[PDB]
Design a protein around this nucleic acid. Structure first.
Ligand SMILES: Nc1ccn([C@@H]2O[C@H](COP(=O)(O)CP(=O)(O)OP(=O)(O)O)[C@@H](O)[C@H]2O)c(=O)n1
Ligand SMILES: [Mg+2]
Ligand SMILES: [Mg+2]
Ligand SMILES: [Zn+2]
Lengths: 94, 14, 1112, 83, 96, 104, 53, 52, 91, 263
DNA sequence: CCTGCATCCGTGAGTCGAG
DNA sequence: TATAATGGGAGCTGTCACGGATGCAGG
C-alpha cells in the first residue's frame, strides 16, 4: 500500500479529490523541475542506483510525500489560474 | 415481393 | 524392463483400422482400382450417372471415366505448394437424333485430390483433413405436435440440398395439410393430381374414425387431375401464367425428377423399413406413361392416420436416436460437390448446345470443366469440414481423422443447436464417445468415434457385439446399428465367465439402454470390450473408472496437445492401446516381411527380405509439422538383426519402441510446497532440465517474395543500403542467411530491397544526403527480419525462381524464398504440463536439486503436485497411477492396466509390498537401521492412525509403503516432513502451450486502415483489446484520465498519440488528448446515411472537429 | 409507469447512449426526426467522444481543485494586497 | 498434507472442513457412493450408482453418469451468454 | 470552443450538396495501368483530395508553399492527404429515392 | 469497499450493474458435478427468474 | 562444453553412416566423465577419429 | 480485388481487413523522426556563418521549402566527419 | 481501395454498392433522355430505389445484394454502424490500445500484495519511449533515434540499458487485467518488479478477485502514461488499496487454499 | 364498430485469445 | 448492323423468446 494512505484519504472529502491534488501537484513539480518543492533536503525521496542515492524521479511519490506534511494548501477557487501561472513562473522559472 | 416476377408480370400485359 | 499386465476380460476381436472411416470411404467414392464396367452406382460414378445424359437435337451421354497417376509425389506436393491429385478423364459421346452421327471422345475434366495412405489430403502444400459430418438421416418421420396434444406431424426429408422438406399435418378443422417451401395447401389436391379417387381413399383410409372425412373434398374429386394440377400450380406459384406443361415441369421437378429431388439410399431404406412398403426409386413420385404415379405420399398418410388413431404397431421417432442420425464421410461430402460442379457443367453443355454451329461440335468444344474444378477446389479449400490438419503428435492426427461434426454446410448452425442435439443419447453407446468433446461453445456438436465403432455404407454407426446362445457366449461378432441393438437384451462385458459359459446367476444387461438384472437364459448378446464405449484418446487413460467424467474429458483432449520430446517415454502404466495407436498412425516404420537388416543409417534403413529383394526405407528427418513440432523417425534396429513381419524398424515422433510416448515418467510427490504449487501451479526439478526431460525441437518457417512492381522490381540481394558488415555477417553472396547460423530477434533472414515510391525528400533528408556525401540510393531495405521473441538455428533454405526448370510462381512474382529455422526448447517457467487424468498446470518454479524434497536414500523428486487439486476435481486415477508407479519404480517394471478391467487395490498392495523389500531390505543389508526422523514420522503417523501402534518401525514403514506414502526429507532443513507423503512415478506431458510463443508486448506499432486503431494479435504485433467490460472496470474505479488515455492517446487520437510519444521521448508530461478518429469516422458514416450530426458548444453554435478540412 | 431494463435503457434522453445499445436504426431515425440533442450527461456518451467521464476524477465536484504552496499563496496575496 | 487412495485429521476431511477446497457431496462421491443419475429427458434411473470413485465405476454406471455430466456441461456453455446479456443491459440502464 | 453537445437531425438535399466537393459521375475506381484515381470516379482527387501530402495528381506543385491552391492542370487542391478521410462526395439522382430507414 | 461513506463522484451505476451481473455469469460457468442431485439444477433455474424481474 | 564435428553445420543435422543423430550423440557426450590430473589445467580438447 | 469484409474464421468474429496495416499515416516514431531530424540538423549547424546560413539553407531548401555555395559545401563536409552521431537518421 | 502486401488489391463493399447505384442512375438518365417507354423507366426507377436501399441498409427489404458467385451479403452503412461488430460497440465503447501486452501467469508467493512480476523483455517494449529518454540522459546512447535503433537487434542490447529500465519504472505501476472482467476488480494496479523469464508473476491473494488460476490462464498488462493516470492507478486502483468487495462489503482478498490449510 | 386475443415480423442472444 | 428467335430460377429446411403492430372473429 502507498505509505500513510489512510491519512491521505482522511485529508479529503472525496478520494478522487486526493487523486486530483496529487496529480496536479506532480505536474507542478515536473514543470518547475522540483524547484518549488516544500520538502527539506533530508525529506527528499531517494532512488537507489548502481552509484548511490539520487533524487527520486517519480513526481507522484514526491507529491504524496509533500501532501503528507501539510505544507500544501488545496481547495477550490484559491486563485485565478492565470495569476497562479504567472506568479509561479516568477518564483520558479523554467 | 420479387422485382423480377413483377417485371415479368408487367411484360405479360402487352 | 518387464511389462506385467492385468485384467480378466479377453478381447475377441482386435481394433478395426482406426483411419478406415476416411480411407475406406474415399476409396469407395473414387473406385480407381475397380474396372470401369464393374464400377457401382456410388460416388463420382453416381454423379456422372445422374448428370448424364444431357439433352437439347443433340444428346450427350456418359460412357466412362478414369483416374490417371499423380503428376507429383506427396513430398514434392508438400514442398512446391501443390495439391496431391490425379487427373480425371471422361469418355463421352455426342449423338445426333436426326443425323444419327455418333462422335465419341475422351475429355479432360481436371484433377481430383487424392487421399494419402494415412487418410489425410495435401491441398496447396498443406496437410488437411476432411471431418465427417453427422446429420439427420433422410426418410419419413413422425413427431408429436408440440402445440396439439392428440395430433402428430409427418415429415418427409430428402438429403441436404437434394430438394425440399415436406410436412403433413392434421388441421383443427379436420383437413389434412401439406407444407412445401413455407406454403400450406390441402393434400387432397395433390393426391388428386397423383391420380387418387374418392373410392381409393375411402377403401384404404376408412378404418380410422372420421380421419378420412377431412381428406374428403367433393369439389376436388369433381375435377380431373389436370385441373387439380393447374390449380395446385396457381397455389404454389401465384402470378405465374398457368400453362399446362409449365405446371407439369414444376411439379415434376419438385416431387418427381430424381435429378432434383433425391432421397439417400439411407432415406430409401428407412422409408421402406418404416412405412412397410417398397420404393421403386429414391423419389416421392414418378412420371410414367405420361401421368403422375405416387410412391411415398399414400403410405405416409396411412401411417399418419394409423398413428393418430392409436393403432398398435406405430411409434413416434426419436430424432436424436442414432438409428435416425447418419454420418456423411469424406467420400459423400466430396461426391456432393462433384455432383454440383457436374450439374453446372451440364448447364454449360446445354447452353453451348443451343448456340454455335450445330454441325461442327465435339465433346471437347461442348464440355467446360471449370465449374467442376471450381466446385471441388472450393470444397477442399474453403469448406468448414475441410480443416488444417493437426499433426502435433501421431495421436493428434489419428483423433482428427475420427472427428464427427454437426456443423458445416447441410448441418446445424450455432444457436440452431438446442440441448437435445448436444445431449448424450443412450444409442451413443459403443458408437460415439460419451466423454471426449470440446469444452465451451462446441460441446455436443463436435465429438469423436468410438474405438470399435464402424460406419457402414448407409452412413450409420455400427458397434460389434457377441452372440450368446443359451447361456453360452459364442465368438460370433455382429456389427449392429442402434435400431438393431434395441431388439436384444445385451449383457455387460465384465460378467463372470467360466470358459464360454455365464458364471453368474444374475447378469447385468441393457434393454433399449435401460439397465436391468436378468437370468443367463435371457442374454441374447454381450459387449465385446469396455474399450468399445470410449474413443481412442479416452481409452489411453488408465484407471479411467476412478476419474470423474469432466476431468476425463480434459485428460482425453490434452493428449492431442502433447509435444514430441527428444527423450520421450511410454507411460509406466499403460492401457495396452499404446502400440496400436503408433502403428495405425503410420508414424512408425515397420518391416513388411521376414528378413535381415542390410543397412542402418541416420537417414535411411535398407532391408533384405526373404524374397531376396533390396528394400530401402528413407527416414523422415527433422520435418516441421503444421503445428511446428518436429516429426522425425529414428532407427530402432542394428545391422544384421533378424526381423519378422510387422516388427519395428524405426521409431516415429512421440514414440518409444512402438509404444506411444507423449511425455516423461517423472518421480512426483503430492504435497503443498511454499505456495509455488498454489492453485494448480507446478514445481519442477532443475535436474529435469539437466538430463533434457521435457525438451522439444520446434521449427518455424519464414517466407518472403520479390515481385515486379510498376516502380521497378524488388530483388533478393546481399547489398542492403546503409548496413554494417556486422548486420550482413551471416548472409551469403545471394543475400540469404547461411545454414547453421544462429539468429536472434532483429537478425536478417533474407535480404531484400524495394524501389521506393515517388518520394519528395524533405529538405532535411536532402541535407543528410549531402552531409554524409553518399548519393541517395534508388532502393530501400525491405529485408525479412527475425520477429520479436523468436529465433534459432537456421536448418534449411528453399529458393524458387522464375525461369528455373520445373518452377512456376503466381503471376507477377519474380522469386520466393523460404527459411526453416529450428530451436531446442527446454522446460521453462510458464510452460504448461498435464497428466492423462485431467490435472493440468503451468510450471511456476524451477528449484535446484538441493531444495527439492528427497527420499531417505538421497533420491530427490522431479515434480511437486498440490493435493488441493485432487478433492474438487474427483479424479482419483492420478492417485492410483502414482501408487502403481511407485512399485514400478523399485521393482523396475512397467504395467498395462486396461480400462474398467484394471489392476485393483489388493494387486497394487502386493506389488508395493514386493517393492518395499527392495526399498528397505537393501538398506538393512547395507548395515543401516531406522532413522530418528523416520521414528518421529512414524510417531506422528501412529497419532494419525496411519499405522498400527506397538509394531516395529520396519513394520510401520511397510504399513505406510502399502498406502503409497513414504518418509520425505525437506531439502532445505533436513528435517522430515511432519507426515508421510504420497510419492511415485507419474506420466506427465508438456502441452503445446508454451510461454515462449505466447508472451507479447507493444508500445506502438501498425494501425488499422479505417479506424486508425492498433491492430490485433501477436502475429501483427498488435495491441490488447480494451473492450466494453474493461472500460466498465475503469469507469467503476472512477479513473477518468486513464480511461481517456485508453480511448484517445493510446488508440485512435493521432495528434494526441504523436504528441504523446514525442512528449515522452523528450521527458515532458503527456499532452491533452484530442478527439479520437473513430468518432470522426462515426460522424462521416452517419452523414453518408443522410443524417447530420453536429458537435455544439453551450450556446448552441456549431463546433468544427474537422478543423476546416471538411468545410468548403 | 414500470418498465424493464431494456425498454428503460432505450427510452433514455441520450440518443448516443441508446443507439450504442440496441435497435440503432430505430433510435437514430427517431432522434434524427426529433432533432435530438445529447447533453453528454452520462458515461457512455462521453466515452464515445473520448471525453473525460463525469465521474471519479472527472467529476465537476473534485476536478477544479487547486494545489498551491504557501510561498506562492502569500505572494499572490501580496499582489492582491498591492492593487 | 497429501492424498493417498487410502483416504476414504484426514486430508479430505481437513480440506473440506477448513474451506481449503471440496464440499461434503464431492467427498461422499469420493467415498460412500455416487448416487442417483439423470436420463437426458430429466427422468431418473431406477438403479442408483452404488460405486464410489475409490471403488471405481462399472462401464454402465459411467455411461449413465455421462448423461447428466453433459447436460450440466451444455448448460454452462449456453446459459452464460444469457447472463452477460443481463449484465450488459444493467450497465446500459444504470451507466449515467 | 469545447464541445458540450451533440445534435442529430435530417439532412436537406441542399445541405448534402453543401457538404460535397463534387458529384461522383463515373462508376470507376482507379486506372488499371497507372493505379491512379480515375477522373470523376469514386476515388478522384479533384473531389476528395490529394493522395500524397501537398502534391497534385499531375505534379506541378510539390511543396507546402502552395496551400489552398488548385492546380489548373489536374484540378487537385494541394493540402494534407488526411482530407480524403473527411471531405464528402455526392450523387445526384435522376429520380428521388426513399431512405429505407424511414420506410421499413 | 472502504467501509466508510461513499466518495462523491464515484460511479454508482456501473458498480451496481457489475455487482449484480458478476455472480450470475460466474455461477453459470462453474462445474455442475452430477449425482445426489435432481430437479432444476440450482443456478440455471434461478437466473431466468432474475431476468424475469 | 563444446562439440565440433566434420561436415556438420548444426545440432539438428545427421551424419551419413551413423545410426544416431547429432543431438543424441551430444546427449551421450554429456554423460562423459573426464578427469583432469593437473590442478592448473582449465580446459582440454579431446580428439576422436573413427570409421568402418 | 478482394473484399475487406471477407470473413476470417468459421464465425462472424473478424474481417480480413483487420489484419492490414495503414502504410500511409506516419506512426508517432516517424513524426518524431522528422522532429528529431530537423532539431539535430538545426543544432549541429552552429558552424554556419549568417550569409552561408541563408544561402546554404536556400541550397538545401530549409527556408522557403525549396563561391559561398562551395565554401558552405566544404564546411558541411567538415562538420559531417565530426560528431559521427547522425548515422541513425540515415537508415 | 488499398494494395495489400502481396501486390493485390483490397476494397470495401461500399465501393461495389456505390458502383451499382451510380450505374443504375446513369442508365436511368440515359433512358430518360432517349425517350424510353413507361414499363422500362418504371423498372429502372425500381432498381434505383433498391440500389439506394442496398447501399443504406442491405437485406432490409427483399433478398440481400451479394457479390457474383458469393452468398455473403454485402456490408451496408447500417451494418457498419450497428451490431456486435458494429462501429459503436467494436470501435467506440471499446478499443485496441497501445502500450499494452499479455502473457501466461505464474504465482509468485514472494511478492507483496501490491506487487507483480513483470518480465524484463515485456517491460522493455512497454516502457520503451521512457527507456529511450533515460538512455539519452545517461551515456548509453548519443540521442533518441540511436537509442531506439540500438534496441532493434537483441544482440545489440547491453547490460546498462537494463539498469536504465530499472530506473525508468521506479515508483510507477502497471495494470493487470484478466478476461473476462466481470466486476471492477478484473483490473488492478500493481507496482511491477522486473523478473527474468517470460511469465508474469501474480500475487496469490488477488487470484480469487481475478478468478485466476494457474492452469494456463493469461493476463494483459497496460501502462498508464500520465502523472494523472498514474495517480488514479496508484491511489484508486492499487491492489493493496481495495481489500473489500464493492458488492457485499466483505473482504475480497482473503486467505484461500494452501494458506487456510496451513493455518 | 370497439374490445380482446391470435398471429406475424423484427430484434436480440458473455469476455479475451488464436486462426 | 438483317433466316427467326417474344415471362427467371433456385430454394437452404433441427432455436427461442421477446415487443410491438396488425388483423380477424366475436360480444
Ligand atoms: N468459455 C469460458 C471458459 C472459461 N472462462 C473462465 O475461465 C475460468 C476457468 O474455467 P475452466 O472451464 O477452464 C475450469 P472451472 O470451470 O473453474 O472448473 P474447475 O474449477 O473444476 O477446474 C472460468 O472461471 C471463467 O472465468 C470463461 O470466461 N469462458
Ligand atoms: Mg484457468
Ligand atoms: Mg476453478
Ligand atoms: Zn497539379
Amino acid at each position: 500500500a502507498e505509505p500513510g494512505i489512510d491519512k491521505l484519504f482522511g485529508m479529503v472529502d472525496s478520494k478522487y479529490r486526493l487523486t486530483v491534488v496529487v496529480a496536479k501537484r506532480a505536474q507542478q513539480l515536473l514543470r518547475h523541475g522540483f524547484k518549488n518543492t516544500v520538502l527539506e533536503p533530508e525529506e527528499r525521496p531517494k532512488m537507489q542506483t548502481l552509484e548511490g542515492l539520487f533524487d527520486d524521479p517519480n513526481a507522484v511519490t514526491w507529491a504524496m510525500k509533500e501532501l503528507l506534511t501539510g505544507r500544501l494548501v488545496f481547495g477550490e477557487n484559491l486563485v485565478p489560474e492565470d495569476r497562479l501561472q504567472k506568479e509561479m513562473e516568477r518564483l520558479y522559472p523554467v | 415481393s420479387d422485382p423480377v416476377r413483377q417485371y415479368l408480370h408487367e411484360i405479360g400485359q402487352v | 524392463m518387464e511389462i506385467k499386465r492385468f485384467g480378466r476380460i479377453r478381447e475377441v476381436i482386435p481394433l478395426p483400422p482406426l483411419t478406415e472411416i476416411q480411407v475406406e470411404s474415399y476409396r469407395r467414392a473414387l473406385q480407381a482400382d475397380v474396372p470401369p464396367e464393374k464400377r457401382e452406382n456410388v460416388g463420382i460414378q453416381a454423379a456422372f450417372r445422374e448428370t448424364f445424359p444431357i439433352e437439347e437435337g443433340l444428346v450427350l451421354d456418359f460412357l466412362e471415366y478414369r483416374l490417371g497417376e499423380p503428376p507429383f509425389p506427396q513430398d514434392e506436393c508438400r514442398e512446391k505448394d501443390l495439391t496431391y491429385q490425379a487427373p480425371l478423364y471422361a469418355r463421352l459421346q455426342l449423338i445426333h437424333k436426326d443425323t444419327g452421327l455418333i462422335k465419341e471422345d475422351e475429355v479432360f475434366l481436371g484433377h481430383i485430390p487424392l487421399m494419402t495412405e494415412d487418410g489425410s489430403f495435401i491441398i496447396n502444400g498443406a496437410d488437411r483433413v476432411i471431418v465427417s459430418q453427422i446429420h439427420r438421416s433422410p426418410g419419413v418421420y413422425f413427431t408429436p405436435d408440440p402445440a396439439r396434444p392428440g395430433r402428430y406431424i409427418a415429415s418427409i426429408i430428402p438429403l441436404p440440398k437434394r430438394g425440399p422438406w415436406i410436412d403433413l399435418e392434421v388441421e383443427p378443422n379436420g383437413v389434412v395439410s401439406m407444407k412445401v417451401n413455407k406454403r400450406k395447401f390441402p393434400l387432397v389436391l395433390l393426391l388428386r393430381v397423383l391420380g387418387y379417387d374418392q373410392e381409393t381413399l375411402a377403401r384404404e383410409l376408412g378404418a380410422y374414425g372420421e380421419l378420412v372425412q377431412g381428406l374428403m373434398d367433393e369439389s376436388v374429386f369433381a375435377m380431373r387431375p389436370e385441373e387439380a394440377l393447374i390449380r395446385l400450380f396457381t397455389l404454389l406459384r401465384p402470378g405465374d401464367p398457368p400453362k399446362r406443361d409449365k405446371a407439369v415441369a414444376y411439379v415434376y421437378g419438385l416431387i418427381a425428377d430424381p435429378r432434383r429431388y433425391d432421397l439417400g439410399e439411407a432415406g430409401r431404406y428407412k422409408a421402406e423399413e418404416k412405412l412397410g412398403i417398397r420404393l421403386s426409386g429414391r423419389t416421392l413420385a414418378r412420371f410414367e406413361d405420361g401421368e403422375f404415379k405416387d410412391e411415398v405420399f399414400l403410405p405416409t398418410l396411412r401411417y399418419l392416420f394409423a398413428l393418430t388413431a392409436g393403432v398398435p404397431g406405430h411409434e413416434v421417432d426419436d430424432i436424436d436416436h442414432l438409428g435416425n442420425r447418419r454420418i456423411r464421410t469424406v467420400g459423400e461430402l466430396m461426391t456432393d460437390q462433384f455432383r454440383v460442379g457436374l450439374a453446372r457443367l451440364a448447364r454449360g453443355v446445354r447452353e453451348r448446345m443451343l448456340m454455335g454451329s450445330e454441325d461442327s461440335l465435339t465433346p471437347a468444344k461442348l464440355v467446360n470443366s471449370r465449374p467442376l474444378e471450381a466446385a471441388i477446389r472450393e470444397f477442399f479449400s474453403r469448406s468448414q469440414l475441410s480443416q488444417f490438419k493437426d499433426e502435433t503428435n501421431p495421436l493428434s492426427s489419428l483423433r482428427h481423422k475420427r472427428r464427427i461434426s454437426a456443423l458445416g454446410p447441410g448441418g446445424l448452425t450455432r444457436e440452431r443447436a438446442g440441448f437435445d442435439v448436444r445431449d448424450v443419447h443412450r444409442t451413443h453407446y459403443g458408437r460415439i464417445c460419451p466423454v471426449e468433446t470440446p469444452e465451451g461453445a462446441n460441446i455436443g456438436l463436435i465429438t469423436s468415434l468410438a474405438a470399435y465403432a464402424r460406419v457402414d455404407e448407409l452412413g450409420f454407426i455400427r458397434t460389434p457385439y457377441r452372440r450368446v446362445v443359451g447361456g453360452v457366449v459364442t465368438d460370433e461378432v455382429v456389427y449392429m446399428t442402434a435400431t438393431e441393438e434395441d431388439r436384444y437384451t445385451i449383457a455387460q462385458a465384465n460378467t463372470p465367465l467360466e470358459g464360454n459359459r455365464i458364471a453368474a446367476e444374475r447378469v447385468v444387461a441393457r434393454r433399449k439402454g435401460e439397465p436391468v438384472i436378468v437370468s443367463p437364459e435371457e442374454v441374447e448378446f454381450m459387449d465385446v470390450s469396455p474399450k468399445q464405449v470410449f474413443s481412442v484418446n479416452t481409452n489411453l487413460i488408465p484407471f479411467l473408472e476412478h476419474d470423474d467424467a469432466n476431468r476425463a474429458l480434459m485428460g482425453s483432449n490434452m493428449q492431442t496437445q502433447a509435444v514430441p520430446l527428444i527423450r520421450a517415454q511410454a507411460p509406466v502404466v499403460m492401457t495396452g492401446l499404446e502400440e496400436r495407436v503408433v502403428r495405425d498412425s503410420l508414424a512408425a516404420l515397420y518391416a513388411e516381411e521376414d528378413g535381415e537388416v542390410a543397412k542402418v543409417d541416420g537417414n535411411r534403413i535398407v532391408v533384405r527380405y526373404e524374397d531376396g529383394r533390396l528394400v530401402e526405407y528413407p527416414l523422415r528427418r527433422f520435418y516441421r509439422s503444421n503445428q511446428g513440432t518436429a516429426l522425425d523417425q529414428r532407427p530402432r534396429v542394428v545391422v544384421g538383426q533378424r526381423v519378422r513381419k510387422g516388427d519395428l524398424l524405426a521409431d516415429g515422433p512421440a514414440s518409444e519402441n512402438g509404444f506411444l510416448a507423449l511425455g516423461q515418467n517423472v518421480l512426483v510427490a503430492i504435497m503443498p510446497f511454499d505456495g509455488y504449487n498454489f492453485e494448480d501451479a507446478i514445481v519442477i526439478s532443475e535436474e529435469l532440465l539437466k538430463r533434457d526431460f521435457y525438451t522439444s525441437i520446434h521449427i518455424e518457417r519464414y517466407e518472403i517474395e520479390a515481385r515486379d512492381t510498376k516502380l521497378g522490381p524488388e530483388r533478393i540481394t546481399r547489398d542492403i543500403p546503409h548496413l554494417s558488415e556486422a548486420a550482413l555477417r551471416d548472409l551469403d553472396e545471394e543475400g540469404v542467411v547461411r545454414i547453421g547460423a544462429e539468429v536472434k530477434p532483429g537478425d536478417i533472414l533474407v535480404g531484400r530491397t524495394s524501389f521506393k515510391g515517388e518520394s519528395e525528400p524533405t529538405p532535411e533528408e536532402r541535407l543528410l544526403r549531402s552531409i554524409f556525401g553518399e548519393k541517395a540510393r534508388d532502393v530501400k531495405d525491405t529485408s525479412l527480419r527475425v520477429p520479436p521473441g523468436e529465433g534459432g538455428i537456421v536448418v534449411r533454405t528453399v529458393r524458387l525462381r522464375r525461369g528455373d526448370p520445373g518452377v512456376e510462381l503466381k503471376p507477377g512474382v519474380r522469386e520466393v524464398v523460404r527459411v526453416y529455422v529450428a530451436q531446442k526448447r527446454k522446460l521453462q517457467v510458464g510452460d504448461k504440463l498435464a497428466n492423462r487424468h485431467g490435472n493440468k498446470g503451468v510450471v511456476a518454479k524451477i528449484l535446484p536439486v538441493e531444495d527439492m524434497p528427497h527420499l531417505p536414500d538421497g533420491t530427490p523428486v522431479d515434480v511437486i503436485l498440490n493435493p488441493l487439486g485432487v478433492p474438487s476435481r474427483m479424479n482419483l486415477g492420478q492417485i492410483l497411477e502414482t501408487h502403481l508407479g511407485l512399485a514400478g519404480y523399485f521393482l523396475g517394471q512397467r504395467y498395462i492396466s486396461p480400462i474398467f478391467d484394471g489392476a485393483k487395490e489388493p494387486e497394487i498392495k502386493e506389488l508395493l509390498a514386493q517393492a518395499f523389500e527392495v526399498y528397505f531390505g537393501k538398506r538393512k543389508g547395507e548395515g543401516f537401521g531406522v532413522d530418528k526422523r523416520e521414528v518421529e514420522v512414524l510417531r506422528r503417523a501412529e497419532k494419525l492412525g496411519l499405522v498400527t501402534p506397538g509394531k516395529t518401525p520396519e513394520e510401520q514403514l511397510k504399513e505406510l509403503f502399502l498406502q503409497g506414502k513414504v518418509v520425505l526429507y525437506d531439502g532445505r532443513t533436513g528435517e522430515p516432513i511432519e507426515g508421510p507423503i504420497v510419492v511415485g512415478q507419474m506420466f506427465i506431458m508438456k502441452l503445446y502451450h508454451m510461454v515462449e510463443d505466447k508472451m507479447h508486448a507493444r508500445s506502438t506499432g501498425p494501425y488499422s486502415l479505417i479506424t486508425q486503431q492498433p491492430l490485433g494479435g501477436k502475429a501483427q504485433f498488435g495491441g490488447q483489446r480494451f473492450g466494453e467490460m474493461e472500460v466498465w472496470a475503469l469507469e467503476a474505479y472512477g479513473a477518468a484520465h486513464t480511461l481517456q488515455e485508453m480511448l484517445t492517446l493510446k488508440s485512435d487520437d493521432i495528434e494526441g498519440r504523436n504528441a504523446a510519444y514525442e512528449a515522452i521521448i523528450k521527458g515532458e508530461d503527456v499532452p491533452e488528448p484530442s478527439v479520437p478518429e473513430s468518432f470522426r469516422v462515426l460522424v462521416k458514416e452517419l452523414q453518408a446515411l443522410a443524417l447530420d450530426v453536429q458537435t455544439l458548444d453551450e450556446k448552441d453554435n456549431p463546433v468544427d472537429i474537422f478543423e476546416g478540412l471538411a468545410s468548403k | 409507469l414500470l418498465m424493464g431494463v431494456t425498454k428503460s435503457a432505450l427510452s433514455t434522453k441520450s440518443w448516443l447512449s441508446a443507439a450504442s445499445f440496441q435497435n440503432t436504426t430505430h433510435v437514430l431515425t427517431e432522434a434524427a426526426i426529433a432533432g435530438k440533442k445529447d447533453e453528454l450527461i452520462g458515461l457512455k456518451e462521453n466515452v464515445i467522444l473520448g471525453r473525460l467521464i463525469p465521474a471519479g476524477t472527472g467529476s465537476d465536484f473534485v476536478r477544479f481543485t487547486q494545489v498551491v504552496d504557501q510561498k506562492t499563496l502569500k505572494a499572490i496575496e501580496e499582489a492582491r494586497k498591492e492593487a | 498434507i497429501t492424498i493417498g487412495i487410502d483416504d476414504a485429521f484426514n486430508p479430505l476431511y481437513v480440506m473440506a472442513q477448513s474451506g481449503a477446497r471440496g464440499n461434503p457431496q464431492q467427498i461422499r462421491q469420493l467415498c460412500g457412493l455416487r448416487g442417483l443419475m439423470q436420463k437426458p429427458s430429466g427422468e431418473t434411473f431406477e438403479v442408483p450408482v452404488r460405486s464410489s470413485f475409490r471403488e471405481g465405476l462399472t462401464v454402465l454406471e459411467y455411461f449413465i453418469s455421462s448423461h447428466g455430466a453433459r447436460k450440466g456441461g451444455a448448460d454452462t456453455a449456453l446459459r452464460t451468454a444469457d447472463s452477460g446479456y443481463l449484465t450488459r443491459k444493467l450497465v446500459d440502464v444504470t451507466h449515467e | 470552443k469545447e464541445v458540450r453537445k451533440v445534435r442529430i437531425a435530417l439532412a436537406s438535399p441542399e445541405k448534402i450538396r453543401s457538404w460535397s466537393y463534387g458529384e461522383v459521375e463515373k462508376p470507376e475506381t482507379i486506372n488499371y495501368r497507372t493505379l491512379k484515381p480515375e477522373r470523376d470516379g469514386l476515388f478522384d482527387e479533384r473531389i476528395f483530395g490529394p493522395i500524397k501530402d501537398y502534391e497534385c495528381a499531375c505534379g506541378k506543385y510539390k511543396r507546402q508553399r502552395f496551400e489552398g491552391k488548385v492546380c489548373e492542370r489536374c484540378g487537385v487542391e494541394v493540402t494534407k492527404s488526411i482530407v480524403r478521410r473527411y471531405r464528402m462526395g455526392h450523387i445526384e439522382l435522376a429520380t428521388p429515392a426513399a431512405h429505407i430507414w424511414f420506410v421499413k | 469497499s472502504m467501509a466508510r461513506p461513499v466518495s462523491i463522484g464515484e460511479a454508482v451505476g456501473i458498480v451496481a450493474a457489475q455487482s449484480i451481473g458478476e455472480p450470475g455469469t460466474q455461477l453459470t460457468m462453474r462445474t455442475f458435478h452430477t449425482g445426489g442431485v435432481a430437479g432444476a439444477a440450482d443456478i440455471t433455474q434461478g437466473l431466468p427468474r432474475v431476468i424475469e424481474l | 562444453t563444446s562439440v565440433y564435428i566434420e561436415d556438420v553445420l548444426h545440432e539438428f543435422s545427421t551424419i551419413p553412416g551413423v545410426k544416431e543423430d547429432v543431438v543424441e550423440i551430444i546427449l551421450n557426450l554429456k554423460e562423459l566423465v573426464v578427469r583432469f590430473l593437473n590442478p592448473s589445467l582449465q580446459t582440454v580438447t579431446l580428439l576422436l577419429k573413427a570409421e568402418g | 480485388p478482394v473484399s475487406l469484409e471477407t470473413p476470417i474464421g468459421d464465425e462472424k468474429d473478424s474481417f480480413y481487413g483487420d489484419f492490414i496495416p495503414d502504410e500511409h499515416l506516419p506512426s508517432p516514431v516517424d513524426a518524431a523522426t522528422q522532429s528529431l531530424l530537423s532539431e539535430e540538423l538545426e543544432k549541429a549547424l552552429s558552424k554556419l556563418s549568417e550569409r552561408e546560413a541563408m544561402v546554404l539553407k536556400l541550397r538545401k531548401g530549409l527556408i522557403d521549402g525549396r563561391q559561398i555555395e562551395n565554401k558552405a559545401l566544404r564546411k558541411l563536409k567538415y562538420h559531417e566527419s565530426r560528431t559521427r552521431k547522425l548515422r541513425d537518421f540515415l537508415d | 481501395m488499398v494494395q495489400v502486401d502481396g501486390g493485390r488489391f483490397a476494397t470495401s463493399d461500399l465501393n461495389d454498392l456505390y458502383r451499382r447505384l451510380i450505374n443504375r442512375n446513369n442508365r436511368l438518365k440515359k433512358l430518360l433522355a432517349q425517350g424510353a417507354p413507361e414499363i422500362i423507366i418504371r423498372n429502372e426507377k425500381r432498381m434505383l430505389q433498391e440500389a439506394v436501399d442496398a447501399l443504406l441498409d442491405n437485406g432490409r427489404r427483399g433478398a440481400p445484394v451479394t457479390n457474383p458467385g458469393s452468398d455473403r451479403p454485402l456490408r451496408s452503412l447500417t451494418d457498419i454502424l450497428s451490431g456486435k461488430q458494429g462501429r459503436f460497440r467494436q470501435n467506440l465503447l471499446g478499443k485496441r490500445v497501445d502500450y499494452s501486452g499479455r502473457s501466461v501467469i505464474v504465482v509468485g508467493p514472494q511478492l507483496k500484495l501490491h506487487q507483480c512480476g513483470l518480465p524484463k523483455r515485456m517491460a522493455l517494449e512497454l516502457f520503451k519511449p521512457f527507456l529511450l529518454k533515460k538512455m539519452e540522459e545517461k551515456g548509453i546512447a548519443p540521442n533518441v533515434k540511436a537509442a531506439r535503433r540500438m534496441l532493434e537487434r537483441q544482440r545489440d542490447i547491453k547490460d546498462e540499458v537494463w539498469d536504465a529500465l530499472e530506473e525508468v519504472i521506479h515508483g510507477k505501476v502497471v495494470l493487470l487485467n484478466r478476461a473476462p472482467t466481470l466486476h471492477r476488480l478484473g483490473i488492478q494496479a500493481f507496482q511491477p518488479v522486473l523478473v527474468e523469464g517470460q511469465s508474469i508473476q501474480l500475487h496469490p491473494l488477488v487470484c480469487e478477485a481475478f478468478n485466476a488460476d494457474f492452469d494456463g490462464d493469461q493476463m494483459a498488462v497496460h501502462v498508464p502514461l500520465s502523472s494523472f493516470a498514474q495517480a488514479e492507478a496508484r491511489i484508486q486502483m492499487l491492489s493493496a488499496h481495495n481489500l473489500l468487495s464493492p458488492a457485499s462489503g466483505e473482504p475480497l482478498a482473503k486467505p484461500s487454499r494452501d494458506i487456510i490449510l496451513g493455518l
